[PDB]
Amino acid sequence: MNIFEMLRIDEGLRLKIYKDTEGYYTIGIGHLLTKSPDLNAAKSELDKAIGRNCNGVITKDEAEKLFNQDVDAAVRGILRNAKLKPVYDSLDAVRRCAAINQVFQMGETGVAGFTNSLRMLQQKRWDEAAVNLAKSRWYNQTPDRAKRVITTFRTGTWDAYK
Ligand SMILES: CCc1ccccc1O
């Protein structure tokens, strides 16, 4: 297991524009195109992202290319965020993957409410962190995925991903 395999499980792979769990136009391995309800705006973002006229469909290679960029962006983002970087750098490599996963799903604004979880994670209070992480819109809206990511934070193992 690694961050790519982990996110591939959590995000799936779809080669045609689809709506994610929040109803937003998405493609590939959880590549968010736009929060706009306009399918044409999503097709425009797709064409811009890939550099050709895709008419809402891409190849596996193109999906994986966006995925590589998106994972990279998630990590570089964390490292640029003064609240996230110190916690991320305190973690072991497995728990870092849980952090990348969460930011990939939610974005940095998405994780702004996680201040108390962040402190517990930096303190290595793993069970307490795990309890706090589940008290969230995140957990309630995507419980099966959140349970996996939380188990990863709690244990520093890949047990939740088999
Ligand atoms: C709250 C979990 C977490 C830890 C460290 C960095 C990002 C992140 O979302």
Curated annotation (Swiss-Prot):
pH profile of the protein: Optimum pH is 7.3.
Binding site for substrate: 32, 104, 117, 132
Active site: 11 (proton donor/acceptor), 20 (proton donor/acceptor)
Induction cue: Expressed late in the viral replication.
Subcellular location: Host cytoplasm
Keyword ATP-binding in record: no
The entry's keywords: Antimicrobial, Bacteriolytic enzyme, Cytolysis, Glycosidase, Host cell lysis by virus, Host cytoplasm, Hydrolase, Viral release from host cell
UniProt-listed Gene3D superfamilies: 1.10.530.40
Functional description taken from the UniProt entry: Endolysin with lysozyme activity that degrades host peptidoglycans and participates with the holin and spanin proteins in the sequential events which lead to the programmed host cell lysis releasing the mature viral particles. Once the holin has permeabilized the host cell membrane, the endolysin can reach the periplasm and break down the peptidoglycan layer.
HAMAP family: ENDOLYSIN_T4
PANTHER family xrefs: T4-TYPE LYSOZYME 1-RELATED
Name assigned to this protein: Endolysin
Organism: Enterobacteria phage T4 (Bacteriophage T4)
